[PDB]
């Protein structure tokens with residue numbers, strides 16, 4: 001009965017971009033995996049010879065899901081190459097917009113991209129809304145009545161009876177599936193909250209446009225600071241604060257309680273999807289030139305040795321091309337990067353992806369929520385420690401539970417809760433600075449003829465870095481090394497499997513035609529392919 | 535996935551960043567939930583669909599072959615170089631998938647500057663030979679309604695579809711095939727700072743007092759005078775727009791803006 005043979009999932013849906021996952025399964029469990037990115041755009045080639053000021057506008061287009069992050073990375077990169085120290089208000093505003101991006105991104109990921117792997121939407125039709133309301137009100141200070149939940153059931157029922165399932169068309173859960181465990185009531189609660197999230201995210205996104213112009217693709221950053229003088233007004237700050245308070249209430253009363261109910265029901269997922277090494281860049285600075293001045297601090301960990309967090313050395317990163325569709329096999333540090341495409345087809349000459357393979361000290365590293373949380377916890381971060389301990393106590397599990405697909409999903413939640421609270425602190429600090437009479441948001445600068453610079457951002461998916469080599473005042477070389485490249489890139493010239501490839505080994509596959517288990521682990525990493533290849 | 539009542543929509547992703555998909559999620563009155571539940575039947579969409587792999591391909595095949603017909607909404611440019619090798623989904627080139635699916639649609643909407651004119655990946659030296667939908671598929675007679683912008687205002691997509699469903703036809707289009715009801719005016723003629731422009735009151739730098747006072751951004755490279763879009767009127771996320779946030783327009787709804795509007799900070 002246990003299946004043995006190949007499984008290909010192309011396209012992997014409910015992620016950003018074009019991913020092809022190939023695995024070899026033996027006796028119902030995965031024994032080998034390949035992460036193949038199937039679209040190349042070549043933004044780094046396009047950037048050559050252009051004005052450095054223009055970079056952020058091209059690079060933001062690397063991705064629309066993690067929208068503002070690349071604009072911030074490029075700007076921090078040119079700010080750095082140029083030697084400018086932006087005003088206090090510029091850092092506050094840039095930080096507040098990034099904080100809002102995290103809340104919007106994670107809420108949408110849990111409900112809209114991840115949840116369908118655990119929730120059987122059709123099973124909500126057979127639930128008792130009165131019992132479901134009892135359950136919902138017991139897990140949250142927010143009380144919901146039988147009437148509240150019946151309203152959702154009625155809407156869902158009519159939709160299903162049309163025969164046009166749309167997004168749910170050939171869903172892996174249709175007709176039931178052995179890997180789906182939720183009872184009808186919990187499925188109904190989760191569905192009501194999925195629908196509710198669709199509207200709440202518009203408000204979470206709006207928060208970014210208050211200071212940022214619009215979302216997607218913000219337009220308020222410039223070398224030297226920001227352009228939004230309107231962000232200084234009490235009216236705009238109040239508008240932002242109101243959106244923030246509502247978004248935080250949703251995180252606290254809806255997202256987290258749901259995460260915990262689902263995790264408790266899927267406790268067995270603490271046994272799959274673990275990884276060995278972690279890297280994180282830190283985020284929310286007080287000093288733009290000091291990574292250790294950030295609310296979350298940078299750090300690297302090998303083989304889960306969290307008692308020995310090592311410092312982050314930027315010169316230790318090299319991107320490999322041996323198993324990628326580029327010329328040759330020489331790995332390069334970003335300031336000496338090369339982007340020379342040469343397609344050989346799937347596995348042609350042992351190459352199978354458009355993504356390069358970043359290695360730290362020759363090692364494959366996981367980056368993202370799990371790495372930021374575990375590293376900050378280990379560094380003694382008070383807020384991260386408090387919330388993680390509460391989550392572990394609620395679930396009745398040990399810390400070892402974190403090294404898994406369930407742990408990675410939980411860490412995304414923990415990160416959202418801590419950041420939501422922190423935006424409130426950053427806001428007060430911003431308010432206090434304005435109160436002192438500081439109304440400056442942009443500083444003057446000058447373009448050098450020859451220089452090098454780098455910008456670091458810890459985005460919702462992990463450590464992001466943009467690298468520039470300026471020659472004759474123009475872009476001599478520009479290279480992007482993004483979170484997903486780290487986690488979803490292919491094997492290197494030493495044949496080390498990437499974090500996603502390695503975590504898939506040992507994954508059970510109940511059915512082989514509806515491999516939801518592969519999706520559970522792949523989605524826990526929150527893949528972004530446009531980001532990874534660029 | 536398809537049947538009677540609700541109109542069928544097939545959403546395709548070529549060489550794109552997903553910013554156009556995200557913009558539709560920002561829909562406001564109607565919101566996205568109303569759109570998917572009552573207004574239309576979203577039958578294929580790689581970003582939010584439940585099915586994956588062969589099941590997704592099956593869902594796609596099912597939608598495109600329906601006797602009820604479908605409307606195609608396309609995001610991203612089509613890479614043409616080296617036989618279309620630079621972009622593949624389910625191991626088929628994007629050129630091939632679009633060549634066979636688009637001619638079968640009742641109507642096709644190219645959503646976003648990438649899908650309409652080539653976009654970011656088509657900028658010099660265009661390594662992948664990326665093209666806009668109408669350019670790449672001219673030989674096949676494909677003529678998509680172009681909704682430009684990077685990303686466009688979602689108000690423009692919903693407005694166009696609602697018009698098509700009501701009138702069973704495309705609205706009036708300009709020479710670039712964009713609806714005149716949303717792209718008939720330059721951003722500049724609708725700008726709150728136009729009075730400053732007329733007075734020659736230009737901000738010389740972003741840190742200046744004139745910038746803080748809201749002076750015109752033309753000297754700082756604003757492309758508003760050469761760009762067609764409805765940004766100052768509709769605004770984004772019901773609250774803001776590039777120049778109201780103090781930054782110049784980069785001409786994102788125009789044909790080869792990455793090369794034509796660059797350097798962004800010069801006029």
Ligand code: SF4
Pocket residue numbers: 061064549550551552553554609610645646647648649653654683684685686
């Ligand atoms: S038009 Fe712009 S926002 Fe839309 S897919 Fe292209 S790069 Fe992304």
Ligand code: SF4
Pocket residue numbers: 721722723725726727728729731749750751752756757758759777782783
């Ligand atoms: S800021 Fe731009 S769009 Fe507004 S008046 Fe000046 S040139 Fe025109």
Ligand code: F3S
Pocket residue numbers: 683684721761762763765775776777782783784785786787
């Ligand atoms: S950059 Fe684009 S979003 Fe509007 S203000 Fe200019 S056409």
Ligand SMILES: [Mg+2]
Pocket residue numbers: 044356479480481482533534
């Ligand atoms: Mg790169």
